[PDB]
């Protein structure tokens, strides 16, 4: 019932009690571990337990548990659900809920930052043009001229499930991908399907390698609509290397603002299906994953060639050498252009400190080791040596089906 986690580098042992407050299921059983699997409406009856659980933790958090104001709010929400089949969160609850969904995100190494989140309440939004406005304002606020600030914008909650708000983009800012007669892929291969949806809905694709995609926004269950984000709001960084003068000629760039927009925020049983949120990048996300995944920009081969490495045999570690250089360049470029970025050493060191705070202050910290350990140089980061327990707490961010599969036109 009480669980221990050990760090094998430092011998520090922490005791987890927070897992006993775990609501949702993991995918694992006593017979099988699904730890490495990527992906493993509410009737009146289901909603009240969920609301009570949430309000209890909320009132506890402001040191008012069992107070008249606590009991009063529980009755008010109970009455509202009994009458309307749903309920509305107070601003204070919504903010607490959003901060806690981030605090609970077991796959996020950046959670030391969880209490500094700007929450933009977009529950009064009714159209896609309204959504576009809210999103530009979020983009501009979060970007802050390179001095990035964490933010989330929360559109109206699901009702009967036929009037869903959705941002169809997987992130607010991404690059288009196009299949060519050639048989190869121009731009980002991850976005080929989405790019085609944009085209089939009207978008004039410039057909380049780094074309910022249009937002495709769905309000109130309606057909989604296209908008170009003002370019002056999309802060991009040209990638150069501090030692290699040829690096700029690869013609690489990335965007400054990582902003996930396809997830669902669950607070007190309510479901916010459009809740784009953003922070700032850890360097490896771009340099290792975006640039080097075989199925992404896949640039290792071109870079290795320019370095004049021996690509005859895997054992020369030519991939590993090129990988480090690409990642030095990402960090140097962002740092030179004064755009907030964190390297994997710094971010994992901060996460270990955050785990210790959470264990000391909350009795635990759900973490998914498979996600938390950076995709390069794993064991030279402290997280590699840290046992982590993974479990699901609410409020939470959850995955949801891509809208093009669900939506009826």
Ligand X SMILES: C[C@H](O)[C@H](O)[C@H]1CNc2nc(N)[nH]c(=O)c2N1
Instruction: Identify the active-site residue in 73, 93, 103, 111.
Output: 111
How does 241-264 read in b/e, with b if 16+ C-beta sit within 10 Å? beebeebeebebebbbbbbbbbbb
Instruction: Identify the active-site residue in 266, 285, 325, 358.
Output: 285
Q: Comparing C-alpha atoms, which of 313, 254, 288 is closest to residue 378?
A: 288
Instruction: Identify the active-site residue in 240, 280, 318, 365.
Output: 280
Q: How many CB atoms lie within 10 A of CB 227?
A: 16
Residues 6+ apart with CB under 8 A from 407: 166, 218, 223, 224
| Active-site annotation holds for 111 | yes
Residues 6+ apart with CB under 8 A from 253: 210, 236, 237, 238, 239
Cα(153)–Cα(356) distance, rounded to whole angstroms? 29
* Under rule CB under 6 A, residue 33 binds ligand X: no
* Under rule CB under 5 A, residue 35 binds Zn ion: yes
Q: How many CB atoms lie within 10 A of CB 118?
A: 16
Residues 6+ apart with CB under 8 A from 195: 176, 177, 178, 187, 205, 213
The interface partner of residue 347, options being ligand HEM, Zn ion, ligand X, none and the CB cut-off 5 to 8 Å by kind, is: ligand HEM
- DSSP track, 228-252: PPPGGGS-EEE---SS-TTGGGG--
| Active-site annotation holds for 285 | yes
Kindly report the backbone phi and psi dihedral angles of residue 390, in degrees, each rounded to the nearest multiple of 5, phi listed first.
-110, 130
* Under rule CB under 5 A, residue 33 binds Zn ion: yes
Residues 6+ apart with CB under 8 A from 384: 373, 378
280 annotated as a binding-site residue: yes
Q: Which residues within the stretch 355-394 sit at the binding site for ligand X (CB under 6 A)?
A: 370-371, 384-387
Beta carbon nearer to Zn ion, 33 or 62:
33
Beta carbon nearer to a copy of itself, 86 or 386:
386
321 annotated as a binding-site residue: no
* Under rule CB under 8 A, residue 159 binds a copy of itself: no
* Under rule CB under 6 A, residue 246 binds ligand X: no
* Under rule CB under 6 A, residue 280 binds ligand HEM: yes
Instruction: Pick from 165, 169, 389, 394 the residue near a copy of itself by CB under 8 A.
Output: 389
Mask: binding to a copy of itself, 266-295, rule CB under 8 A, as x and -? -----------------x----xx--xxxx
Q: Which residues within the stretch 99-128 sit at the binding site for ligand AXW (CB under 6 A)?
A: 110
Beta carbons of 19 and 365 less than 8 angstroms apart = no
Beta carbon nearer to ligand HEM, 109 or 383:
109
- Using CB under 6 A, count the residues that bind ligand AXW: 12
Cα(55)–Cα(66) distance, rounded to whole angstroms? 11
Beta carbon nearer to ligand X, 52 or 385:
385
Q: Which residues within the stretch 284-303 sit at the binding site for ligand AXW (CB under 6 A)?
A: 285
384 annotated as a binding-site residue: yes
The interface partner of residue 189, options being Zn ion, ligand AXW, a copy of itself, none and the CB cut-off 5 to 8 Å by kind, is: none
Beta carbon nearer to a copy of itself, 10 or 92:
10
User: What CA–CA distances, in Å, run from 291 to 197, 242, 380?
Assistant: 24, 18, 22
Instruction: Pick from 54, 254, 255, 277 the residue near ligand AXW by CB under 6 A.
Output: 277
Cα(78)–Cα(71) distance, rounded to whole angstroms? 11
Residues 6+ apart with CB under 8 A from 191: 170, 174, 175, 176, 177, 213
* Under rule CB under 6 A, residue 8 binds ligand X: yes
Residue 264 CB, shortest distance to ligand HEM, in Å, is: 10
* Under rule CB under 6 A, residue 279 binds ligand AXW: yes
Beta carbons of 152 and 120 less than 8 angstroms apart = yes
Q: Which residues bind a copy of itself (CB under 8 A)?
A: 3, 5-6, 8-9, 19, 22, 25-38, 283, 288-289, 292-295, 300, 314-317, 319-321, 323-324, 327-328, 331, 335, 343, 345-346, 368-370, 373-380, 384-391
Q: Which residues bind Zn ion (CB under 5 A)?
A: 28, 33, 35
Active-site residue numbers? 108, 111, 280, 285
């Amino acid at each position: 019932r009480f669980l221990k986690v050990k760090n094998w580098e430092t011998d520090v042992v922490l005791t987890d009690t927070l897992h006993l407050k775990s609501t949702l299921e993991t995918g694992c059983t006593e017979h099988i571990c699904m730890g490495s699997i990527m992906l493993p409406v509410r009737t009146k009856d289901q909603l009240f337990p969920l609301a009570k659980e949430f309000l209890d933790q909320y009132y506890s958090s402001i040191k008012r548990f069992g107070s008249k104001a606590h009991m009063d709010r529980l009755e008010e929400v109970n009455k509202e659900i009994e009458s309307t089949s749903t309920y509305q969160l107070k601003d204070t609850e919504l903010i607490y809920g959003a901060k806690h969904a981030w605090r609970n995100a077991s796959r996020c190494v950046g959670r030391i930052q969880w209490s500094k989140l700007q929450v933009f309440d977009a529950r009064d939004c009714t159209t896609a043009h309204g959504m576009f406005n809210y999103i530009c304002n979020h983009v501009k606020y979060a970007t802050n001229k390179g001095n990035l600030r964490s933010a989330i914008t929360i559109f109206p909650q699901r009702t009967d499930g036929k009037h869903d708000f959705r941002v169809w983009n997987s992130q607010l800012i991404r690059y288009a991908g196009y299949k060519q007669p050639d048989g190869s892929t121009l731009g980002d291969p991850a976005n080929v399907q989405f790019t085609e949806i944009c085209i089939q809905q009207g978008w004039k694709a410039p057909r380049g390698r780094f074309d910022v995609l249009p937002l495709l926004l769905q309000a109130n269950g309606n057909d989604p609509e296209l908008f170009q984000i003002p370019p002056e709001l999309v802060l991009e960084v040209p990638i150069r290397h501090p030692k290699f003068d040829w690096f700029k000629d690869l013609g690489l760039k990335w965007y400054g603002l990582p902003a996930v927009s396809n997830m669902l925020l669950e607070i007190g049983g309510l479901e916010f299906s459009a809740c784009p949120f953003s922070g700032w990048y850890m360097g490896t996300e771009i340099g290792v994953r975006d640039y080097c995944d075989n199925s992404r920009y896949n640039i290792l081969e071109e870079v290795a060639k320019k370095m004049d490495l021996d690509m005859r045999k895997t054992s020369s570690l030519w991939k590993d050498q090129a990988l480090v250089e690409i990642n030095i360049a990402v960090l140097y470029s962002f740092q030179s252009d004064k755009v907030t970025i964190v390297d994997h050493h710094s971010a994992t060191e901060s996460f270990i400190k955050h785990m210790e705070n959470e264990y000391r202050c909350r009795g635990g910290c759900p973490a998914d080791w498979v996600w938390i350990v950076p995709p390069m140089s794993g064991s030279i980061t402290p997280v590699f040596h840290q046992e982590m327990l993974n479990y699901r707490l609410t409020p939470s961010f959850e995955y949801q089906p891509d809208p093009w599969n669900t939506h009826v036109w």
